[PDB]
Amino acid sequence: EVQLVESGGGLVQPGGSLRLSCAASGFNISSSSIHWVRQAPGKGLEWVASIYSYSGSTYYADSVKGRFTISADTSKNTAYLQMNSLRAEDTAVYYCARHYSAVAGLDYWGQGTLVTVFNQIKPPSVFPLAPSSKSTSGGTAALGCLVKDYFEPVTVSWNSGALTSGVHTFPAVLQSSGLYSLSSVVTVPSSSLGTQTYICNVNHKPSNTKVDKKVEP
Amino acid sequence: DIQMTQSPSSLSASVGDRVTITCRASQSVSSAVAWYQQKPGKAPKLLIYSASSLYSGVPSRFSGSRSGTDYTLTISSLQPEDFATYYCQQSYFNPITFGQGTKVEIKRTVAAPSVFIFPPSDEQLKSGTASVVCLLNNFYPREAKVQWKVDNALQSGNSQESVTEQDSKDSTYSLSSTLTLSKADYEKHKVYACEVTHQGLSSPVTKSFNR
Amino acid sequence: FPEHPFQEEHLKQLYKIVPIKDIRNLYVTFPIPDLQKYYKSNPGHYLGHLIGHEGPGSLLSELKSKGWVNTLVGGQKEGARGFMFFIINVDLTEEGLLHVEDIILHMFQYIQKLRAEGPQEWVFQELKDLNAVAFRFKDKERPRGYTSKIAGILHYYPLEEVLTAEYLLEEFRPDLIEMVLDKLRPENVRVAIVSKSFEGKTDRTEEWYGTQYKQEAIPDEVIKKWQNADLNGKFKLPTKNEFIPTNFEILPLEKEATPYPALIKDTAMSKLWFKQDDKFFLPKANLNFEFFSPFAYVDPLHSNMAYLYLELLKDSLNEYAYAAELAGLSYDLQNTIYGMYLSVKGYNDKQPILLKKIIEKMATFEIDEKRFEIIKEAYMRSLNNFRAEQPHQHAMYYLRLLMTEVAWTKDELKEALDDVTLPRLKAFIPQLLSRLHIEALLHGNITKQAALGIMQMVEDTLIEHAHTKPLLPSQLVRYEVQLPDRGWFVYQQRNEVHNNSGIEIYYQTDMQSTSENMFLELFAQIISEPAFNTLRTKEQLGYIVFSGPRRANGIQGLRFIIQSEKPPHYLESRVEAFLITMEKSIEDMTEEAFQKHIQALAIRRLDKPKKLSAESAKYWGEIISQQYNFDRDNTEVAYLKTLTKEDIIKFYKEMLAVDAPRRHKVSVHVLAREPEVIQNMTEFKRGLPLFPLVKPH
After folding, report:
1. A202-212 per-residue burial string, b: 16 or more CB within 10 A, e: under 16
2. Where does the UniProt annotation locate this protein (chain B) (predicted)?
3. What DSSP element (H or E) covers C26?
4. C105 and B93: CB-CB below 8 Å?
5. Phi and psi dihedrals of C165, rounded to 5?
6. C90-122 residues labelled b (16+ CB within 10 A) or e (exposed)
7. Opening angle at CA C497, ends C491 and C502, nearest 5
8. Least CA distance to A173: which residue of chain B?
9. Which has the closest alpha carbon to C508: C572, C553, C568, C478?
10. What's the CA dihedral at C438, C441, C446, C451 to 10 degrees?
11. Cis link prior to B141 (omega < 30° from 0)?
12. Residue of C15, C68, C95, C98 to mutate, interface with A, max A Cβ within 10 Å
C-alpha cells in the first residue's frame, strides 16, 4: 500500500551534514505528506522536519529552524532532506513516516535510520568473569563476559551461538569516554564452571570485530 | 510550543487489563491528537487517530476518547503483544509534541533475583580494572535497593547497574551491579559485599565473598 | 451566464504561476453572484471594507506582529455579468513562502472571527457616515473618462442612479452577509500562486499567450486542518471609532477683515498665528505645529534618538490611528534639524480631542524592548544602504552639508549606533520633554476663542505631564560659511558604488530681499531655457542635468543638478563655457524674449489658491524663516517690472563676472565608483567670519 523506504541516513560527524533520500513509494507525496521524527535511543520523541512538495512549505523545530533545506521530487514522489549542522546530541532514529489525511493521522512509518552523530569506533577488550568457589553459591551459578572499552552495543551469543536461553545480555553502559559497556550473564550450574566453558561470541557492529572469549575458573 | 504529558509514563499490567492512558495537554487543544504504539526495537505505530477513532489493522481492544483537554486513550484489554512503548501526537503548525513514553509491563508474582556476585577476570585486573559484577537475575519487578558495602562501609557512585528488560523467559529482569573501581582499589578493598534489598526481598541479602 | 463557469475543476486548487513582471502575489477567488441588485449594504464592498480592514487586534496586526506578509487585499472585484469575483491578493516576501497555509489559516481564523462576530451594526452606521460624507464631499474629477465611467454605471443604473451608484448604504443586511459567508468558504477557493523561479517547472499552458502553470492540488489533511481549526485565540475585532465629523454647517467670516494668518496669541510657551477660511468654505481644518528643541543638535546619537523616536512613535500610535487612516483624516509628524514637526489634517469637528489623545499618548508613552531593536536594526541596515546612494542625492546632501554652521556626518552616525541603548533615550525623553517649544498655527472654518481654549488645553496637558518650561529667545538661536567672495573652492569625494561623477557650482546671493529674489529667479530662469536649448538638448552629456535655485535658512542660492562621469576640470570648463554663452546670449536677448520671459516668471508666480494645503505649504515656508510676508506677490511683481536689460547687467558684472568681487563661486566634486585645493573640513570651518541674521517676523 503505502511504502516508506528510507535510505541515505548513514554516517555523519558532529557539526556535520547529510542529505536524505526516502523512497516513499506506493502513494503520492502530492497527496498527504510524510514528515521527520527525532528519537535518540533512550530518549523521547521530537518532530524534525516537514516537506510539502505540492506547495513548497518547509517546517522545522525552533532550534533547527532555517539551518536545513528540505525537498521532494513529487513527479517520482521521492522525499529528500538536506541535513545540515548536525550536532552530536542528534544521534537519533529519523523516521520517514507518512501522515495521512486525518486530523492527526500519522499511520504509516519507515523503520527509520539511526543517523549517528557519534565520535568513536573501537573494537572491544572482552574479558570474562572470574568463577571461583565463592561464586559457586551452591549448585546455582552463572558465567559471563564483560565486553569492555568498545564503541554500537555488541551482539553476544554463546558457544558458536548455542547457549541463548537464560542469557541476560545487558544494555550497554555508554561511559564517559564515548565507549559502551554491557554484560551478558547466563545461569549455569556450578559443576559446568570448567566442564562446559562457554565462549562469548562478541560482535562489535561498527568495527565488525569478532572476539570469541572463553569464560573459565 | 504547547506541550504534552503522557500520563502514566510507565505501568505494569497483565494480559486482559483495561488501561487508561492520558496525554495531558498544556493548553486548549482541538481534535488534533493521535495515539501511538512503539514496540521496542521496532518502528512505531498509530493506535488511535482523531483521539477516538480506530485505524485499520489495529484491533478493537484499543478505544481512544476525546477527554476534555487531557485526552485519554482507553485500552479495553491487553494482549501478550501489547507490551510496547506507547505515545501520542499533537498536530498543528505549532511544533508538534508527542507522547512522553508509556511502556506496558506485566503484573506477576514478585520473583526473587538470582543474587550472585562475580569478580573481574584476571586479564581485566591486568588491564587495571575491577568490575565486581554483583549479579541479580530473573527478578520481578525492577524495584529493588542494591547497596555496595566496600570494606563493610556503604559506598555509592562506584556502582554500575545495567538492567535487562522484561524477560522472554518469565517477564522478569536481570541486574549486573558492577562495582567499578581499580586494581589499586581491588587489592585495597578485599571485602566486597553486595547488599541487595528488593521490594519483595525487603530483608537485605548481602552477597559477600573474600577475594 | 446563468451558471458559474468556475466549474468544479478549480475549487481548493493551487496554481503556481510564473509571471512576466518581476512580481510575487497570491490570489484567492470566490465567484459570487450578481448582487448589483443587493446594493442596500453592498456586502462585497462591505467585505472590501472589513476584509480590507487592518486594525486593532487585526489579522494583519498579528501578522505584522509576526512580520511575514506586509500588505494584502480582499474585496469585491467584478468578474463577468452574472457573477462577480472576490479576489484576495496579498504581498509576498520570500519568508512567507514556507508559511503559506498557515497564513491561509490566519485568514481563516479571521473569517471565523467575523463569523463568530457575525453581523456588525456599528460598521454599517459608521461606513454609512463615511459614504455619505465622501460622496457628499467628493471634490471634482477630470471630465474626460469620468463620463464614460458613469456611463458604465448608466447601463447598470438608471438616469437618477449614476451618481448614487454605490454611494449610499440603505439597510443593514446580516443575512446577505451570511449569504456571502456561504460564498466565502474553504471549499470555494481558487489558489493562484505567483513566483518567477518556476520556469522549467510549470507545464500546464495558457492558450493565447502561452504561459505555463500547474494544478498540483492540496491534500485533504491540510484541507481538513483548515476545516476543523475554526477556533479563536489572539484575534480580536475593532470597536467603534471615537470620532465622526458632524460639523459641516459652515460658520461665517466675522469682524476680522484680514485675509491672512494672524498672530492672535503669544505667551512664554504659546505663539498662535491664526486664520479663518474665506476662499473655499470647506469644513476641513489643517494644523501645523513645530517642536523646537535645543536637544536637536546634540549628537548623532541624539539625532537617531529623535529620529527613531518619532519613527517608532508615529508607527506605534498608528496602531491606534487606523480608524483615522480609515477616516481619511490625515496628519504628519516630521523631524527637523531644529526639532520636530506636527501636522493635523481633515475636518474641524473632533481634531482637538483626538489630538489631545495623540498628545497624551506621545507624552505618556511606554517602551517595548525587542520591537524597538528590530526597528533599530532596520534603520541600521538603512544607513548601511545609505552609502550606496546617488551622487545627485548626495549632492543635495552636500546642499544640506556645507551650507550650515554645524552638522553630523553619516560616519559619525555609523559608529554611534553601537552606542545606542534603550534606557538612554528612555531616560532622555523626560530630559527632552521638560523644555522644548511649540508655536501654534491654526487655519480653517474655526472660531477664535474656541481655538484659544483648545490650544491652551493642549499645552496645559503638556505642562501637566512633563512640565515643559519655556526657553530664552536667544535659546532659539540659528545656524552660514563666510566667503572670501571671490575665491573658488572645491573638494572631491569619490563614490563607492555608482560610476557617475557629480558636479555643481553654487552661488549664494543674499537673503530673500525683493531685490535678490527677482535677481535669482529671473536670472535662473533666463539661463534655464537656453540651457534647455543647447546643453541638455544639443550637447547631451548626461540625462541628469538641471539648474535651479536654492531656498533654505531664509537664504537664497544657485544649484546645478549635474551627474555624469566626466573629467572634472573638463566639465568645469563646459559649465564655464555656458557661463560665457549666457554672458553673450543675454546681451543678445532683445526686449521681446525679455518681456515674454518675465511674463513666464509672472505666471510662474501667479497662481490662485487651490487648497489650504498648497497655500499652507507656502505659509510653512513663510513660517520657518519667520518672515510672514503674505503680500510679497504683488510687491515682487512690481519689482520685476523695474528690471531692465541694463539692470540685469548691473546684476552681472558686480557678482557674476570672472573678475567680479562678489564671485560667490564654490563647487563640490564627486568622482566615479573608483585656485587651490581644500585641505580639511575642519579647515573649511576653521577660519571664518559669519553672516548678519535676517530680521524675523
Report:
1. bbbeeeebebe
2. Cell membrane; Secreted
3. strand C25-29
4. yes
5. -100, -55
6. bebeeebbbbbbbbbbbbbbbbbbbeeeebbee
7. 35
8. B162
9. C553
10. 20
11. yes
12. C98
HSE-up (13 A, CA, CB side) for residue B90: 27
Q: Which chains touch C (3 or more CB pairs under 8 A)?
A: A, B
Nearest to C506 by CA among C597, C400, C598, C604: C400
d(CA C2, CA C83): 9
Query: Are the CB atoms for C34 and C81 separated by under 8 Å?
Result: yes
- Cβ within 8 Å, pair A105-C218: no
Backbone angles phi, psi at B198, to 5 degrees: -80, 170
Which residues, at least 6 apart from C571, have a Cβ–Cβ distance to it below 8 Å?
Answer: C501, C503, C541, C562, C564
CA distances for C534 relative to C90, C93, C530, angstroms: 49, 47, 6
Count of CB pairs separated by less than 8 Å, A with B: 153
Q: Which three cell numbers stand for residue B154?
A: 556503604
> End-to-end alpha-carbon separation of chain C, Å?
70
C-chain CB neighbours of A105 within 8 Å are: 221
Report the SS3 class of residue A137. strand
**What is the experimental resolution, given in Å to one decimal place?**
6.5
| Grid cell digits, residue C69 | 506578509
Angle between helices C121-136 and C43-50 (to 10 degrees): 100
Task: Tell me how far apart the alpha carbons of residues A28 and C273 are, in angstroms, rounded to a whole number.
Answer: 75
C-alpha cell at B189: 578493598
Query: C332 pairs with which residues across the strands?
Result: C343
Q: How far apart are the first and last CA of chain B?
A: 57
Give the up-direction half-sphere exposure of residue C115: CA atoms within 13 A in the CB hemisphere: 17
Establish whether C204 is an annotated binding residue: no
Burial degree of C4 (CB within 10 A; 0-12, 13-18, 19+): middle
Phi, then psi, of C334 in degrees rounded to 5: -145, 145
Elucidation method: cryo-EM
Cβ-based neighbour number of residue C514 at 10 Å: 15
Scanning the structure block, which residue is given the C-alpha cell 550497554?
A172
Residue C90 · residue C63 · CB < 8 Å: no
* Cα C601 to Cα C623: distance, rounded to the nearest angstrom: 24
Reduced to 3 states (helix: H, G, I; strand: E, B; else coil), residue C326 is helix
Q: Which of C68, C109, C226, C228 to mutate to test the interface with B (most CBs of B within 10 A)?
A: C228
| Strands in chain B per DSSP E | 4-7, 10-12, 19-25, 35-38, 44-49, 53-54, 62-65, 71-75, 85-88, 102-105, 130-139, 144-150, 153-155, 159-163, 173-181, 192-198, 205-207
